[PDB]
Amino acid sequence: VDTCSLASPASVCRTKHLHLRCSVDFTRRTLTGTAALTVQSQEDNLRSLVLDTKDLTIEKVVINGQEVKYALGERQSYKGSPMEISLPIALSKNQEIVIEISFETSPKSSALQWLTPEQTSGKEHPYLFSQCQAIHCRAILPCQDTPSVKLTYTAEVSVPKELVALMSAIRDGETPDPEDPSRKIYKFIQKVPIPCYLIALVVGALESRQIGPRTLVWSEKEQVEKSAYEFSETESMLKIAEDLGGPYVWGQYDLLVLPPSFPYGGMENPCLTFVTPTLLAGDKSLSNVIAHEISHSWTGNLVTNKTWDHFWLNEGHTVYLERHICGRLFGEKFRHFNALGGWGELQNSVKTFGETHPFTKLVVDLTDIDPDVAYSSVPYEKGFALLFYLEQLLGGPEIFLGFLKAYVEKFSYKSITTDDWKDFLYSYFKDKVDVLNQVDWNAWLYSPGLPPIKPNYDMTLTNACIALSQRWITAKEDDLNSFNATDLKDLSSHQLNEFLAQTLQRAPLPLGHIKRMQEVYNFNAINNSEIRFRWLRLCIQSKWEDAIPLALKMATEQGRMKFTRPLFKDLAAFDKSHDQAVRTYQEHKASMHPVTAMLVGKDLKVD
Numbered sequence: 365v366d367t368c369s370l371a372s373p374a375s376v377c378r379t380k381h382l383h384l385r386c387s388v389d390f391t392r393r394t395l396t397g398t399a400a401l402t403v404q405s406q407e408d409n410l411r412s413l414v415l416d417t418k419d420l421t422i423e424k425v426v427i428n429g430q431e432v433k434y435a436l437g438e439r440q441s442y443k444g445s446p447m448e449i450s451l452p453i454a455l456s457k458n459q460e461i462v463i464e465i466s467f468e469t470s471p472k473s474s475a476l477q478w479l480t481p482e483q484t485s486g487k488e489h490p491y492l493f494s495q496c497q498a499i500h501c502r503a504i505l506p507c508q509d510t511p512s513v514k515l516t517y518t519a520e521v522s523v524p525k526e527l528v529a530l531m532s533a534i535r536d537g538e539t540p541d542p543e544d545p546s547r548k549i550y551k552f553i554q555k556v557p558i559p560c561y562l563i564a565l566v567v568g569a570l571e572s573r574q575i576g577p578r579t580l581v582w583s584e585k586e587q588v589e590k591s592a593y594e595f596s597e598t599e600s601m602l603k604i605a606e607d608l609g610g611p612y613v614w615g616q617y618d619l620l621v622l623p624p625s626f627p628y629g630g631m632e633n634p635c636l637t638f639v640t641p642t643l644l645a646g647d648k649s650l651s652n653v654i655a656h657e658i659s660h661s662w663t664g665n666l667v668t669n670k671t672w673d674h675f676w677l678n679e680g681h682t683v684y685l686e687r688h689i690c691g692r693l694f695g696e697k698f699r700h701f702n703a704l705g706g707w708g709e710l711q712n713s714v715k716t717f718g719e720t721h722p723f724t725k726l727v728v729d730l731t732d733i734d735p736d737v738a739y740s741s742v743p744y745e746k747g748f749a750l751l752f753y754l755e756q757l758l759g760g761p762e763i764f765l766g767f768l769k770a771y772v773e774k775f776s777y778k779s780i781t782t783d784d785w786k787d788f789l790y791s792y793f794k795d796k797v798d799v800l801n802q803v804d805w806n807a808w809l810y811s812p813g814l815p816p817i818k819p820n821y822d823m824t825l826t827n828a829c830i831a832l833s834q835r836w837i838t839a840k841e842d843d844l845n846s847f848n849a850t851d852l853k854d855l856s857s858h859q860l861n862e863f864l865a866q867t868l869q870r871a872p873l874p875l876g877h878i879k880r881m882q883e884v885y886n887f888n889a890i891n892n893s894e895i896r897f898r899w900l901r902l903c904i905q906s907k908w909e910d911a912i913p914l915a916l917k918m919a920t921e922q923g924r925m926k927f928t929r930p931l932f933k934d935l936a937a938f939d940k941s942h943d944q945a946v947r948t949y950q951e952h953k954a955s956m957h958p959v960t961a962m963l964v965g966k967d968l969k970v971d
C-alpha cells in the first residue's frame with residue numbers, strides 16, 4: 365500500500381503511457397493543456413478509477429472522443445484531491461483505454477516555481493522549473509502519483525519562441541507553434557518507463573554547452589561556461605558508473621544548472637539532471653553530487669522504490685555507488701574519507717532529530733506525514749552505512765559490487781520493497797547465509813538511532829582534519845597566536861570542510877577562537893558554499909554577531925534547503941539575530957520556492 369497517493373493502486377490499474385500537450389503561460393503562471401493517460405486495468409470488470417491531483421483545474425475528461433463523468437474529491441491537505449473517472453466501458457483485466465484529461469495548473473502549484481526576470485541571471489526573461497519528488501507531480505497533471513507505477517511519456521510544450529523548454533526526456537525536435545507565431549513547441553520522448561516523480565520541466569533563456577559524447581550542460585548564458593568546466597568529469601563518471609552498474613539505458617545525460625532557489629543539490633531526473641548553482645565552486649570539488657545524480661540512473665531511476673517508505677533503497681544504494689565512483693577516480697583512501705564523513709553527518713542527523721525520532725529509522729511509515737517534512741540525510745547516510753557494513757561483512761568491495769550489478773539487473777525497470785531487496789541479498793549470498801543472519805535486521809531497518817554496528821573506516825586522509833580540530837578545541841588563550849595560514853598548506857578542499865564539521869560538532873567555541881580563526885584562515889573569503897556554510901554555522905553558533913549579515917545573505921541568496929534551513933534555524937536560535945531572521949523570512953517568503961517556504965516557516969514556527 366502506498367499511503368501517499370489517493371489514486372488507484374497498481375493492483376487495480378496502471379499508467380503505461382503519458383502524452384502531454386501543454387502551453388506555459390508566464391502571465392497567468394499556469395500550465396494548460398491535456399494529459400493522455402493510457403491506463404491498463406489489473407482486474408476483471410473495472411468500471412472506474414481514481415487519479416491524484418493537487419490544486420488542479422479540470423475542464424473535461426474525454427475517452428473515445430466523448431466526454432465522460434468525473435469527480436474531484438475533497439482535499440486531504442498535502443495529498444491533494446482524489447479524482448474519480450467513470451469509464452464508458454467496463455474493462456477486462458489487462459485491457460487498456462486512453463484517458464484525455466484537459467487540465468490547468470494553479471499558480472500556487474507545490475511542484476512549480478515561477479521566476480520573474482528580476483529573479484534570474486539575464487534579467488530579461490522569466491523562468492520556470494519543476495520538482496516532482498516526492499509527490500508534487502500531482503500538482504502538475506493528474507496521475508497515479510506513486511513510484512509503484514512506471515510509465516513512458518511523450519510531450520509537446522508550447523513556450524514563447526524566445527525561450528527554451530527542456531524535459532526529463534530525449535529532445536524530439538522544435539517547431540513554431542501553428543496556433544500562435546509568438547510561441548515554439550518543443551517535443552520530447554522518454555522511451556524508458558519511469559515513475560511519475562521523475563517527470564520534469566524547465567522553461568527559460570537557456571543555452572547549452574557540450575562536455576561529452578552524450579552530455580550537454582544547460583543554464584543561463586551567465587553560467588553555462590562556469591558550469592561546463594565545473595562538471596567536466598561527467599563522462600569519466602558515467603563510464604565508471606557503467607562499469608559498476610551496467611549499461612546506462614537513458615541515452616543522453618544532460619545537466620541543467622538552475623537558478624539559486626532550486627531546493628536541492630540535484631535531482632536525478634532522467635536524461636536531464638537538475639543541480640544547484642552552489643556546486644559551481646570553480647575547482648570541481650563538489651562534483652560528487654554529479655556522481656550521485658549519475659548513479660541514480662541505476663539505483664532509483666531504473667530500480668525504483670515501490671512506496672516512499674522504502675526510499676532508502678533509492679538513496680542508500682545511490683550514495684554507495686557515488687563513493688565507489690569517487691573511489692575509482694581518486695583512490696580507495698578517498699572513498700573511505702567520504703564514507704567516514706557520511707558517518708559524521710549521520711551523527712548530526714540523529715543528534716538533531718533525537719535518538720528515538722521515527723525518522724531516524726531506515727524504513728519509515730509515512731502515513732499522515734508530509735514527505736517534504738520527513739526528508740533528511742538519514743536514508744542517504746544510514747542507508748549507506750548498512751551497505752558499507754555488508755560489504756565488509758561479506759568479503760569486501762569487489763564481492764559486494766558483484767551483488768550490486770546483479771541487484772540492478774534483477775530489478776531493472778521495476779519497483780521493489782525493502783523485503784524484495786532482502787530476499788535477493790539472501791539469494792545472491794546463499795553461500796553466506798550464516799554471515800547474513802549475523803546481522804541484526806530489525807535494528808538496521810526498523811529501529812531508530814545510529815546503526816547497531818559502526819563500519820571500519822580508513823583514517824589516512826581524515827587524521828589531519830582531526831589533528832587541526834583538536835588544537836582549536838583544546839587551545840587556551842595563549843595558544844591562539846601560534847595558529848597561522850600554514851596550518852592549511854596541505855589540506856584539500858574536502859579536508860578543509862571536514863575540519864569545519866569536526867569543529868562545528870563541538871560548538872560553541874570561545875568567541876576569541878572564532879575571531880582568531882577568521883584572522884589566520886580568512887574563511888570569510890571562501891566561496892565554496894559547503895565550506896562557507898559550515899563556517900557561518902560555527903560563527904553563529906559561537907555567538908559572533910559579525911556573522912549575522914553573512915549568514916543572512918547566504919541563507920537568502922540561494923535556496924538549497926541543505927544550507928538555508930540550518931542557517932535560518934541557527935540564526936533564529938541566536939538571540940541577537942532572531943528578529944532579523946524571522947523578519948527576513950517574512951520579507952522573502954513570497955519569492956522563495958513553495959516547498960522551501962513552507963518548511964522554513966515550520967522551522968521558524970511562523971504562520
Ligand SMILES: COc1ccc(Cc2ccc(-c3csc(N)n3)cc2)cc1
Pocket residue numbers: 497498499672673674675676722723724725726727728735736738739740742743
Ligand atoms: C525531493 O526529495 C524527496 C522528498 C520526499 C521524499 C519521500 C521520502 C521517503 C522516505 C524518507 C525517509 C526514509 S528513512 C527517513 N528518516 N526518511 C524521506 C523522504 C523523497 C525525496
Ligand SMILES: [Zn+2]
Pocket residue numbers: 632656660679682
Ligand atoms: Zn539522491
